[PDB]
Design a protein around this nucleic acid. Structure first.
Lengths: 119, 69, 155, 264
RNA sequence: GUGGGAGAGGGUGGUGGAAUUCCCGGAGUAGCGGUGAAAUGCGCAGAUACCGGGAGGAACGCCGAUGGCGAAGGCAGCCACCUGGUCCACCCGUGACGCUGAGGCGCGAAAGCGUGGGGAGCAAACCGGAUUACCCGGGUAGUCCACGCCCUAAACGAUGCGCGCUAGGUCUCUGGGUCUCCUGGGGGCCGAAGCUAACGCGUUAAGCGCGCCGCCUGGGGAGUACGGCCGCAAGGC
């Protein structure tokens, strides 16, 4: 549809779920994939295998738009970051760089009950 | 190898000596601890003050992104 | 066992063919310590194999055995009070054990009246690539990596 | 299974407190194991048991051979109407009692809703915690006072019949159990314009207890949210109520306040 | 007094970025979120991922320390102003001007409260869901500011203050000198003599002495009753 020929793949690796979004350099999201769209529900949504499947699915459905090379930045500290990145790079798109951009507060808002008691 | 080792002669209160200041920041725009810098606390404290001041001036990054998986 | 690693018994190879796997199959057929009956029934089945199928029955046996040798199995796991059929690799020893057991179990299920007929038919069918033993192997294999999500539990 | 009382002594004493006689009738809520039911049925003209537990009912049902007054009705007391029960099962004995030794997280809403159900019965005796027992049977200007005391003031005058040790209960609760009595009044304790409006008022007053009556009524009341600008006349309508709280005031004070509220 | 030093000590203005939540757009397809597993819940009025612009409140990531400051309670972005305490050096001035302290006066975490503001996030009470027959989804006061109350704690080093004497070893913070080292002050860990019922303390004494103050006289009843004083109240002595 667009055929930018060079975009970027965002990997939102939360604890409960992993989300993969591929987009142009302009930030316009062409498409996305998740553990949920594969069909996995509940606990197994954030499993490394689900991350692998989500990465492959996103890559496959992105190949239709003619994407060949991406520059990935990973977000979140979920269990399946490494699995997702390896699957994505071993899907058929030549990744230039692999980067993390996990958002960390500068001691801002007061977190949830469970996430408190910071050292 | 401590960051101090791979350096010569400089001033710490000089909040404009930007080129040496990039040295004391990590792969991410974080101030390296005393284990990495290789300074005494007084030096570490004054350097941290200077680093924050330069950050306010916009000469230095508050944070960056790291090229790794 | 807690202490040792329970060294494997080295079966004496059969005298007819000089093969240990033949001895394993003989022992697997055996019940109530009737060695002679198991040997005779196996040799009968070999006669059927020879009569109906050209090549030596040992080749058919080996072909079927390597046809049934699985590669993936599930082991019930206890994590957070839930049962997980965690896929795991099977060792060659366990491979052959399961293959022999499955072949013998499947051979008995056949409606044919005589034992030798059942053994020969099941074994030759497994050599072909189908039957009961092959079906069970495929079922086991597909049951594994159907939930390869849980495979992160290395055991 | 919750903490179950095992003492025949205190059970006898409590069933005495229930005044279960020939004339007296019994409603059983959550028959459970069937010790209370044992001590009640033998002296009751007709026992109607309500429970929704799957298997806690039919097992007990086996033991109910010697008893002829055990009309066990398998349903939830909250969900199911009880009005019909008065006509159908109290033909033997018009007198009504409700006795319970259940866990309190189920017991207290059951009692509240039963009183809301508007069924005219003589009284109720239930088993509850010490703190909640103090909360119900409370006097003005108390820490144990609140809206619950006000609610129960319309229906009954209460007093803990017999304080219960923790030992008698199998697992031991940390806090002492105290059985209270609730014997329904002839009618409403003090008259009011609207019952629902009264309840809204009492909720508003005791929402943020520590604050002044004025600060409570300014922010708590929904119609107060409407007439925030108008609260001036609300202050005007107050009679002999100065800088005050909720706990300070009594049943008649709140009743007069509600009657004044309708006139605003 | 003079010449220097370190420091989240306090008060007043100013403003730096990263989050979080909303608003305004562009693209985006079926889920998002949540758990031990789930449900409630949000999403076809196009959610969640993601790009840009804007608003608002709160708190300061690495440095960071087993660190520092203060009489305690406490004090972390940065800049500037007004101030409190303290250490070393020169031995320069005074001549005992000192110690403690019943009442008094003042300060006093957090939670409450009155009168006005503010409200991003979290969250008493509360509305929901569910299972192990606590936990997740929402949400009020409150947490934020100005003025005025409240005066309570495991307010702890469970150790009142000041001064003098009694082996050392080791790690730190901060000064001075003639700089492998000497000499001060602060914070930890072992341990002489000694002390203690014991645990343990030990030049930062719980050692050896002196001065002053505050408390104790078996456990409950009971920090209760009465009386008094202080508060709007809860409550405090």
């Amino acid at each position: 549809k667009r055929q930018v020929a060079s975009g970027r793949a965002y990997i939102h690796a939360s604890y409960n779920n992993t989300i993969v979004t591929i987009t142009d350099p302009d930030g316009n999201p062409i498409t996305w994939s998740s553990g949920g769209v594969i069909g996995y529900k509940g606990s197994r949504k954030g499993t490394p295998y689900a991350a692998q499947l989500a990465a492959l699915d996103a890559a496959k459905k992105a190949m239709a738009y003619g994407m060949q090379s991406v520059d990935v930045i990973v977000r979140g500290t979920g269990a399946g970051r490494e699995q997702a990145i390896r699957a994505l790079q071993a899907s058929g798109l030549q990744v230039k760089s692999i980067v993390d951009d996990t958002p960390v507060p500068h001691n801002g808002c007061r977190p949830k009950k469970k996430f408190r008691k910071a050292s | 190898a401590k960051v101090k080792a791979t350096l010569g002669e400089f001033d710490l209160r000089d909040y404009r000596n930007v080129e040496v200041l990039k040295r004391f920041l990590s792969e991410t725009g974080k101030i390296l601890p005393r284990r990495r810098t290789g300074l005494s606390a007084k030096e570490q404290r004054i350097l941290a003050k200077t680093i924050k001041r330069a950050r306010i001036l916009g000469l230095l990054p508050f944070t960056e992104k790291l090229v790794r998986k | 066992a807690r202490r040792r690693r329970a060294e494997v018994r080295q079966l004496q190879p059969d005298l007819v063919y000089g093969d240990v796997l033949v001895t394993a199959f003989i022992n697997k057929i055996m019940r109530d310590g009737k060695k002679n009956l198991a040997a005779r029934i196996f040799y009968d089945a070999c006669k059927i194999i020879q009569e109906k199928t050209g090549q030596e029955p040992l080749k058919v046996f080996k072909q079927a055995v390597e046809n049934v040798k699985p590669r993936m199995e599930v082991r019930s796991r206890r994590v957070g009070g839930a049962n997980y059929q965690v896929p795991m690799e099977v060792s060659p020893r366990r491979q052959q054990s399961l293959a022999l057991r499955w072949l013998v179990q499947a051979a008995n299920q056949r409606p044919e009246r005589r034992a030798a007929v059942r053994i020969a038919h099941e074994l030759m069918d497994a050599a072909e690539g189908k039957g009961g033993a092959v079906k069970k192997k495929e079922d086991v294999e597909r049951m594994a990596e159907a939930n390869r999500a849980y495979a992160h539990y290395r055991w | 299974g919750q903490n179950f009382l095992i003492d025949t002594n205190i059970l006898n004493r409590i069933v005495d407190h229930a005044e279960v006689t020939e004339k007296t009738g019994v409603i059983e809520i959550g028959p459970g194991i069937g010790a209370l039911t044992e001590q009640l049925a033998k002296r009751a003209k007709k026992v109607v048991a309500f429970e929704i537990d799957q298997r806690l009912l039919p097992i007990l049902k086996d033991t109910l051979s010697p008893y002829e007054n055990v009309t066990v009705i398998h349903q939830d007391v909250l969900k199911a109407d009880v009005k019909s029960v008065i006509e159908e099962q109290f033909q033997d004995c018009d007198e009504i009692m409700v006795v319970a030794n259940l866990p309190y997280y189920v017991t207290t809403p059951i009692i509240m809703k039963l009183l809301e159900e508007h069924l005219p019965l003589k009284g109720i005796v239930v088993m509850l915690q010490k703190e909640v027992a103090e909360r119900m049977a409370a006097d003005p200007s108390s820490k144990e006072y609140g809206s619950l005391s006000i609610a129960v003031q319309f229906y009954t005058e209460a007093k803990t019949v017999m304080i219960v040790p923790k030992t008698v209960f199998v697992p031991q609760p940390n806090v002492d159990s105290a059985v209270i009595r609730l014997i329904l009044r002839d009618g409403p304790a003090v008259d009011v314009e609207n019952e629902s409006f009264f309840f809204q008022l009492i909720k508003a007053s005791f929402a943020q207890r520590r604050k002044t009556l004025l600060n409570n009524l300014v922010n708590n009341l929904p119609e107060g949210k409407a007439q925030k600008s108008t609260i001036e006349q609300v202050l005007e309508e107050t009679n002999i109520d100065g800088k005050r709280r909720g706990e300070s005031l009594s049943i008649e004070e709140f009743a007069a306040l509600s009657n004044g509220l309708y006139k605003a």
